[PDB]
């Protein structure tokens, strides 16, 4: 992962992150498809509907939901790689997402006091 950790501002910290493209595209392909597929779902016949001839309206929803999905994943993986401490609710601060390209976003939080 590609991680930057800024530090200090009265216990405050900010972690700025750069997410790969191929890693999150597994979540789009695999994850999505998978969790959709079996669990219940509706009137899907064989597979689960390829993008096909309903149009790419559902595409706007692939590409757009993928713009949301794409966001989410690495930021969790990233904060792990420059390692840091938790304490109460995290604040997710999104950047601009560009399709098929790398994604940046941030976490502000507090830490439990230590000595």
Task: Give the experimental resolution in Å.
Answer: 7.7
What's the CATH fold of domain 2-108? Alpha-Beta Plaits (3.30.70)
Across the beta sheet with 2-7, the strand order is 2-7, 13-18, 105-108, 91-94
Phi first, then psi, for residue 19 (nearest 5°) are -85, 135
Residue spans per domain, the chain: 2-108
Phi first, then psi, for residue 64 (nearest 5°) are -75, -50
Experimental method: cryo-EM
User: 32: helix, coil or strand?
Assistant: helix
Helices (DSSP H) in the chain: which residue ranges? 22-27, 33-37, 57-81
- Note whether 100 and 21 are within 8 A (CB): yes
């Amino acid at each position: 992962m590609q991680v930057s950790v800024e530090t200090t501002q009265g216990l405050g910290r900010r972690v700025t992150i750069t997410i790969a493209a191929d890693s999150i595209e597994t979540a789009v392909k695999s994850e999505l498809v998978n969790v959709a597929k079996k669990v219940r779902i509706d009137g899907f016949r064989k597979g689960k509907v390829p993008m096909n001839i309903v149009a790419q309206r559902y595409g706007a929803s692939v590409r757009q939901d993928v713009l949301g999905d794409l966001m989410s994943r690495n930021f969790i993986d990233a904060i792990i790689k420059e390692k840091i401490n938790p304490a109460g609710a995290p604040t997710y601060v999104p950047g601009e997402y560009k399709l098929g390209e790398d994604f940046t976003y941030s976490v502000e939080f507090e830490v439990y006091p230590e000595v």
